[PDB]
Design a protein around this ligand. Structure first.
Ligand SMILES: NC(=O)C1=CN([C@@H]2O[C@H](COP(=O)(O)OP(=O)(O)OC[C@H]3O[C@@H](n4cnc5c(N)ncnc54)[C@H](OP(=O)(O)O)[C@@H]3O)[C@@H](O)[C@H]2O)C=CC1
Ligand SMILES: NC(=O)C1=CN([C@@H]2O[C@H](COP(=O)(O)OP(=O)(O)OC[C@H]3O[C@@H](n4cnc5c(N)ncnc54)[C@H](OP(=O)(O)O)[C@@H]3O)[C@@H](O)[C@H]2O)C=CC1
Ligand SMILES: NC(=O)C1=CN([C@@H]2O[C@H](COP(=O)(O)OP(=O)(O)OC[C@H]3O[C@@H](n4cnc5c(N)ncnc54)[C@H](OP(=O)(O)O)[C@@H]3O)[C@@H](O)[C@H]2O)C=CC1
Ligand SMILES: NC(=O)C1=CN([C@@H]2O[C@H](COP(=O)(O)OP(=O)(O)OC[C@H]3O[C@@H](n4cnc5c(N)ncnc54)[C@H](OP(=O)(O)O)[C@@H]3O)[C@@H](O)[C@H]2O)C=CC1
Ligand SMILES: OC[C@H]1O[C@H](O)[C@H](O)[C@@H](O)[C@@H]1O
Ligand SMILES: OC[C@H]1O[C@H](O)[C@H](O)[C@@H](O)[C@@H]1O
Lengths: 381, 381, 381, 381
């Protein structure tokens, strides 16, 4: 019959009010400083814009071999033009104490190099995936991290994507029952004219074909969805011999893996078919379909049983968790601040490279490769 | 300003009217008489009920080893108690001209026998899939068919399924661009307490495990979707050794194939996980998702591109085409009446048995098996 | 390590087996004989074919004003040519004990007549909706029913529809929280060239336009979803004056209702737009979307909350419940046999006719019409 | 056989490269300066964070009556603490030539006030919806805009949301055929304890209930989807008399409108049921379903016909157009820069308020209100 206290007490006159309700991740500070190395497609389309959403990170400086671009980029994000390094004086960042970490967004073959030069610079490292083009180079990056007593983090965004985490969460709850068969697919049409794609066609720079580039999402995903490691691996690859895009690196490759629990999986990556990011986890109770499974946006998951399809996706008005990009950046910032192990350490990034090598080996020999090497996911998936 | 002639002409008193518009297949004739062999799960749940929707077929007789069950089923479908046969006096159907064909729905290893006896009895044959448990037996059936000058059709219900034909049509019309990667998955939890599943647990009666039973859908489907034959296959199978269900047949099995066009495929079948029937066909212009892919009901397909998902399924009020069960049944009928070849001939059933053989061989030896033997799909896919 | 007793016991030679597991409603008996009246669109497309799936019903006779059509239909459904009646000798069915009930599928204005003659002939009645074209006529039918001591059931197929019952069940179980707003829409393009639509264009034969024909679904559905009766209605209708289809009946009409609980609803029906059958039920905890809501096939419902869409539809392999056509038919049958009241009695059909009357009145006067007349749903919704 | 020129020419050594391909809206500058007035829920959750994505806008200063908050906010977005005004010295912004415009994000009753004081300050105006609490106050805002020769823009984000524009685009293409029936629903549970909701419960501050707050999306949407104005209106409202939340403003209200083309529509807004944002446009060719229809994120649209559902939504990896928030902000910036009329001028915002008044009037009197007042959408919908 009567308005509650608060309503009637609101002044019909201009008056300040308390802080509003938060339905979205609010900014909190920018204490952690980042130095972005490699201003390419991913860096300028996804990572740089992804800072605005961070709660504890900022872009302190840039590192590029194209002075002009690095200039324009500096302006857009207001980075001090004096904090613009190149690949030869990159080490001079050790002087600046405001540059807490470095984000390596360079070709796969250059990752390690700048990670080590970074650690010797006493800075923390955030390296893109795949880690490096060799298991040995991954180990070195890890060795250089422990020496400088710094943290090494691999850019596994899917480890910071709400829907992916929701997927892991529901699976741990045993919503699918006993796990028995995982299926994954990751694809996109390779455009040789794309500046970012040219280095990907060189085995020396990329380290391999579609598997190293996107099939790793299937590999990595199969691992955290099932929450365990493969003990065995089998694989096959094929590329049109008349396609100049696959002279050095593979187009399509298919791998089958077995897990300790007894679960199986089959997946593939492709450079010659359109966008595909689909993961399927089959249990004896229900089946999970993630599609889109690893998109930058619009992921969608569904738990199906005869007669039902329970879909989950980002809300339309509220935002229960920060986006993967911002969440990934702040994660390292957090890790350091609160002195804690990062969820995606150098070891994790090395596991995938080591597994990928085993897979390329299996496809070359047509024989299965034993991958039961006691790796342990510290901190869980 | 005035009603059309059709409206104003309708009398306002009880009056005869013309034949109505058909928004669904109408019954036409019951010229083709069938003798059903084996009153089991598929027969009583799907085929017998499937007869009602037929436009040229009827159930004329029954053949069962359970007189009690046969008596009950005959009464339910208006079958004359005098036309109930057992497996001993089966051959006597040769004396009844009202029996035009037989439909074998017996376990796998019993197929060839009855197909042959049926042909010796001067009848056409509809045999359930998988055709037989040996390539040789498939050929013997094809031989008996040719010696009797009768038709041999294999129960590939998906070859008469409205949504599957629609998927084949948009592919042939190049809606997906060039085809490069196909993924299939077919699973369902095997229940050893189900009378129907008991013979499936026996290698001698079944001819194999999940591949023979349901993996065949991913295989056959991959073939009719791509519109070409595999020239090579690789595979690996695994089953929990402590599970009483898989002592003789396999639970999970995965296979990879390469086609003359260069396309690749990877699929699996499972006897230990929940209901999955999902086909994916990746083209360089679009991706096709069939899910459910091979259901008895509610099939749904979708053509995806960045930003779009065009779905197709059976309408909610109209029924443009007959269901797969009824259509399959009328297909043999029409073939005989029109003196035309069947779309699912014994040769088609044999190609699958032959391929499954290659797949089992490959999983056994851990090596790729060449399947470039020149099978040619007579009449398109 | 060893197969279960059930598996090892299966003989390897042709042998009789037990009755299989049912993943779908099996035929049981054909005790209840029906006489179908009016071999038109609904009858030949939906009802006659709907008999096959029945578990207690059968077609015993036909009543048509087109001897030619009746002869053809009788042959298609095994009906004895001797049991074909016309509208003149209809009353003679009273002499046949094999005729237990009649199913009136004649245009609206002819319903009451035949329902009454059927009752005078000592038969039960299944009458299509909308019940009649006047409240009085509905009561006369109810009176004839009570005088004959027979049952009167109205063809509300959605009251026996698996997905609609599921929607009613999750609502009753408070899955949507408190109910506050319901939206309905029912449309389809009226084609004056369709023999079936010709009488629908005539006010005298139809009793009204899209509201009487299909608007009734949104109305009836709003009532069974909310589980309560409207106490007040408002409405407005409009039809293009130059369209020959709407000279006598309305094309588009919209209505609003308020219920005792306080809930509100707003829906419409259209004779000029494409296929729409969508029901929305807004609760304070969740929102339910039925779309298609009242299809002959492929119904789908979804319970939405920020970040989720839990879908439910008929399974792809199993059939937990019989279809609405067959179930409706068996419902009257079982009621007679079990000496139990029907769920869709003449009173239910009358409540709708009465409400539609109020709605037309409201649109005519532009004022709200009070409908708080105390109808009570006997047997729940 | 050989890698194309570009691939082989990429240096295996650290080397700068040209600007990458743009798959996402890139930043371009921040020439247009904004002064945000009213730091509430919407301002801090949606508008402030929405600047990072802009290509021509920045946050030059803030205006608040809560010094402390306005401080913290300044820090987070790096706004010069000297450019922090209050509601009494707000006019002092006229001094600063770097403050090109003002974004009024205050209670509905305060909109006009600050718009006029803004225009006299020689600045451009971006006012939130609904425009004001009276047609007269809207006219004054327009008069004050022409005097200062500045631009007036209403915050109709949906006029800058990709999916909404895609929806308008497909409809103009006649993909739905002749338009005949639009249905809309907009709801969310009102929380009286929410600081932002308290003023919304006061008729003096809000100007009305759910209609003024969110039902306006249905009203506005119905207009640009059909691309025309209503000539007539009818409406009804009801709220639980024992609910202290609706003593002064309405909870649920339902309106029906007719359009010149002959199209009809029914819609409603609610403060007592969960999130609902669903628009339906029915044509005689197809039907469009927008659901979510006006979300901040995850909108989804579908074009349905018997057997088809063509869905469209934001891509998962690319981003063809900037988000509604950023797009809205830059729109004004554009309008000014290129000297052009804004798509959402004060007149448009006044049309909705004028229509809403007509609707409240219709519900009060229970009679239809003629709204055929020759309004014209300059620039189209
Ligand atoms: N997490 C994920 O979602 C994704 C991660 N990535 C990873 O990010 C890294 C970069 O990928 P992407 O941005 O697509 O690639 P681009 O080719 O767009 O960027 C590579 C950048 O590296 C720098 N660079 C230095 N020397 C070399 C060299 N020898 N050849 C080529 N570039 C060089 C350049 O910076 P400059 O011109 O400024 O000097 C160049 O712009 C890869 O490791 C990739 O796997 C990429 C996409 C997605
Ligand atoms: N196209 C498709 O969708 C499907 C095809 N099928 C195929 O249908 C066939 C039968 O499968 P299903 O109906 O599930 O099996 P069931 O075991 O339920 O039925 C087989 C019937 O065969 C007869 N029979 C004769 N000798 C034997 C024997 N020694 N062991 C078991 N049965 C025997 C029995 O009939 P009676 O008691 O009358 O004598 C039995 O009921 C298989 O080849 C299977 O692959 C099955 C399901 C789906
Ligand atoms: N539950 C639901 O889903 C549906 C219910 N219905 C209802 O079924 C009833 C019939 O509809 P529908 O089948 O579409 O209509 P049709 O006009 O196609 O069939 C009506 C039948 O009534 C007989 N008839 C007798 N006198 C007349 C007369 N003067 N004018 C027209 N028909 C007459 C004819 O049968 P004959 O030629 O054999 O003598 C005619 O075929 C209606 O009450 C309708 O509301 C319809 C569709 C769906
Ligand atoms: N386009 C859209 O999507 C949306 C638009 N809006 C519109 O934005 C406007 C504000 O909505 P919203 O942010 O939800 O509301 P909040 O109550 O969260 O914000 C109102 C802000 O107005 C200022 N204010 C000044 N005096 C008053 C007063 N008398 N009472 C209340 N606040 C006052 C305060 O700023 P301070 O405390 O800093 O002094 C307050 O924080 C409304 O017109 C609303 O319709 C809102 C949501 C969605
Ligand atoms: O193409 C990859 C394939 O390699 C081989 C394996 O036996 C098979 O299971 C796997 O799918
Ligand atoms: O509740 C709103 C209602 O107002 C009255 C109108 O006649 C009706 O069409 C509309 O739906």
């Amino acid at each position: 019959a009567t308005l509650p206290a608060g309503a009637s007490q609101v002044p019909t006159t201009p008056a300040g009010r308390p802080m509003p309700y938060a339905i979205r991740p609010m900014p909190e500070d920018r204490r952690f400083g980042y130095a972005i190395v490699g201003l390419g497609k991913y860096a300028l389309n996804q990572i740089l814009p992804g800072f605005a959403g961070c709660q504890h990170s900022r872009i302190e400086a840039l590192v590029s071999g194209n002075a002009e671009k690095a200039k324009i980029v500096a302006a857009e994000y207001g980075v001090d033009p004096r904090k613009i390094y190149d690949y030869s004086n990159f080490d001079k960042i050790a002087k600046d104490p405001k540059i807490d970490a470095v984000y390596i967004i360079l070709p796969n073959s250059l990752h390690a190099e700048f990670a080590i030069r970074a650690f010797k610079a006493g800075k923390h490292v955030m390296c893109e995936k795949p880690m490096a083009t060799s298991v040995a180079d991954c180990q070195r990056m890890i060795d250089a991290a422990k020496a400088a007593n710094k943290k090494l983090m691999i850019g596994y965004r899917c480890h910071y994507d709400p829907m992916n985490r929701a997927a892991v969460k529901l699976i741990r709850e045993n919503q699918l029952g006993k796990l028995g068969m995982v299926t994954t697919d990751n694809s996109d049409v390779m455009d040789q004219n794309d500046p970012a794609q040219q280095w990907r066609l060189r085995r020396e720079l990329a380290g391999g074909g579609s598997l190293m580039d996107i099939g790793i999402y299937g590999l990595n995903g199969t691992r955290y969805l099932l929450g365990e490691e493969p003990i065995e691996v089998r694989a096959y690859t094929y590329s049109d011999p008349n396609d100049e895009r696959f002279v050095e690196v593979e187009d399509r490759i298919i791998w089958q893996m077995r897990f300790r629990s007894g679960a199986l999986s089959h997946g593939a990556s492709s450079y010659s078919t359109t966008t595909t990011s689909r993961f399927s986890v089959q249990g004896d109770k229900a089946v999970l379909l993630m599609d889109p499974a690893t998109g930058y946006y619009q992921n969608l998951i569904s738990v199906q049983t005869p007669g039902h399809a329970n879909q989950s996706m980002m809300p339309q008005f509220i935002m229960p968790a920060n986006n993967q990009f911002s969440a990934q950046l702040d994660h390292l910032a957090e890790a350091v601040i609160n002195n804690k192990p990062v969820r995606s350490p150098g070891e994790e990034g090395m596991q995938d490279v080591r597994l990928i090598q085993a897979i390329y080996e299996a496809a070359r020999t047509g024989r299965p490769v034993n991958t039961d090497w006691g790796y342990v996911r510290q901190g869980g998936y």
